[PDB]
Structure formats: structure tokens, C-alpha cells
Amino acid sequence: SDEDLLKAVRLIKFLYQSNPPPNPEGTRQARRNRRRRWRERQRQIHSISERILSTYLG
């Protein structure tokens, strides 16, 4: 449970580390596309985090 919790946090940390911010140049519609795609993925990681953590917090 304590080692599970640590492993879940190291995992959540990995997920956040796997979605780094893209180059903010604002050059093309493709630059703002990447930002939109980054945000969706961030929100998803935020939601996956809360749900995983709530199983450890009760």
C-alpha cells in the first residue's frame, strides 16, 4: 500500500514527464495545434492522477 502509493506517484510523475511543453513559437496553425493537443493530454493526465490518488486517499 505504501510502496504501491510511491509507485503510483512515480508513475504519475512519469506521465507528466512524458508530455513536455512543445516549442512555443506560434509560427503556423500547426504550432497552436500542438498546444491544443498538449492541453488535451495534460487535462487527461490530471484526471488520471486524481482518480488513481483518490483510491489511496479513501
Epitope: 509507485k7 503510483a8 508513475l11 512519469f14 482518480r51 488513481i52
Partner: antibody, heavy 117, light 110 residues
Framework: QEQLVESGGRLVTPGTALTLTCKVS????????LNWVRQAPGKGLEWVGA??????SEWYASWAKGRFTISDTSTTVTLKLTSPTTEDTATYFC????????????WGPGTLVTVSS | ELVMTQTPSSVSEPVGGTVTIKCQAS??????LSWYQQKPGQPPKLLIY???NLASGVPSRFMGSGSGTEYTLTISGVQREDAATYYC????????????FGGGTELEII
């Protein structure tokens, strides 16, 4: 595109350490949950465990811990049966979660393990 | 830790009838619930994801719903090809309670 192929299924005597391999191909994704599911003949599906592919994050069912080891490779995910018994006779499938949302979208055809003397 | 109680164990229904399959979660899983169809000699196939969403390539007669701890798989106009065994999958691999399959439902068509 996305493909999973399991191999290593053999006839073994009890206590014979065995490794099954899930050949992972055509996945655009880097990190994803690669799950191991088993089915004894005429029985239901049972979750064994999973590994989150980018990391070394292994998760096991309460009954699976100590008896199974999931390991990640460059192009593969392995499942080692440390000390099999007759109760471990089953078809073992690998199943990938492509979204991180918990559900299994891609499955392998399975590999059969028979534990008998 | 997580236990998914699936009922009934077996159902016999004539072509055109409605099939109701239930899964009860031992812990709060929210939308972490999916339904699978398995036919002999084949791996299982995804039907419903996130409790109520229809998966790609699945007939519209397959419906998923969830209220708290109770989850339902409805097959409205049962066809001969729907004869199979059905399973729910609850939870998440990194959740404190892990992830678990229900005991399955064997559907036979009259």
C-alpha cells in the same frame, strides 16, 4: 498497424520456470499499459498484471504477486511464471490499452500453457 | 482488492429479444468500466468503453450504462451472431484496488 503476438506456450511439469513473450509492433504510442490476461480451459478471463511501457512500473493482481514477473523490452513485454502449478494451466493473452483510460483495445491471439506431470 | 460481480451466469434468448447483463463493483470505479465479447477459439473483443461509449465496429444494438456501483450491458435486438460469452472489466492497473474481470455471462440464442 497495431499488433500483439504471444509465444512461449509449452507443456511443463509443476515448478518449471517459464517465460512468455508478447511481440509488440506497429504502436505509434511510446508509453501505454501492456496487460496480461489468462483464461483456464472453460473458464473466465483473469487479469494477471500490467507494465506501463515507457517506465518500469509493474502492477500485479493480489494472487499474481511473487508467482509472475512482467518485464519490458525494446520490442517486447515478457511474463515469467516463477513456479507454476496445475492451477496455472491457461491460455495467456497480452492486451494493450491505447488511451491510458483502462480499457483494452488490442489483443494477441493467446499462447497456451499446460502444467502437468 | 476490486471484485466485479457479474450476473447472470447464462442467458438463453430468441432472435429479436432484449438481453440485460449486470456488473456490480466492490469499490467506486466511476467510468473505469468496459464490456467484452468472446467467441470460441478467439481473443475477446471490446464492445463498450468508459461505461457507456460504443466501440468502433460494434452494432448499435449493444448499449452500456452505469449508475454508481451498478453497470449494465443491454443487447436490444439479439442476433444469432451475438451467441458468445460476455465480460466486464472494472478499475485501473495503478489503482489501490487494481483492475478486475467479472465472472462472465454465457449467451445462447434460440
Amino acid at each position: 498497424q497495431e499488433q500483439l503476438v504471444e509465444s512461449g506456450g509449452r507443456l511443463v511439469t509443476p515448478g518449471t520456470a517459464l517465460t512468455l513473450t508478447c511481440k509488440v509492433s506497429g504502436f505509434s504510442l511510446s508509453g501505454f499499459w501492456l496487460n496480461w490476461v489468462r483464461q483456464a480451459p472453460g473458464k473466465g478471463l483473469e487479469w494477471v498484471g500490467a507494465i506501463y511501457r515507457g517506465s518500469g512500473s509493474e502492477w500485479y493482481a493480489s494472487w499474481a504477486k511473487g508467482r509472475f514477473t512482467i518485464s519490458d523490452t525494446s520490442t517486447t513485454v515478457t511474463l515469467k511464471l516463477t513456479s507454476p502449478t496445475t492451477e496455472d494451466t491457461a491460455t495467456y493473452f497480452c492486451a494493450a490499452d491505447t488511451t491510458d483510460n483502462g480499457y483494452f483495445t488490442i489483443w494477441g491471439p493467446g499462447t497456451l500453457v499446460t502444467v502437468s506431470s | 482488492e476490486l471484485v466485479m460481480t457479474q450476473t447472470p451466469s447464462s442467458v438463453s434468448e430468441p432472435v429479436g429479444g432484449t438481453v440485460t447483463i449486470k456488473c456490480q463493483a466492490s469499490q467506486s470505479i466511476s467510468s473505469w468500466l468496459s464490456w467484452y465479447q468472446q467467441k470460441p477459439g478467439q481473443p475477446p473483443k471490446l464492445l463498450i468503453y468508459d461505461a457507456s461509449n460504443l466501440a468502433s465496429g460494434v452494432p448499435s444494438r449493444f448499449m452500456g450504462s452505469g449508475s454508481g456501483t451498478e453497470y449494465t450491458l443491454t443487447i436490444s435486438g439479439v442476433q444469432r451472431e451475438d451467441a458468445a460469452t460476455y465480460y466486464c472489466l472494472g478499475g485501473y492497473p495503478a489503482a489501490s484496488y487494481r483492475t478486475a474481470f467479472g465472472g462472465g455471462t454465457e449467451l445462447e440464442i434460440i
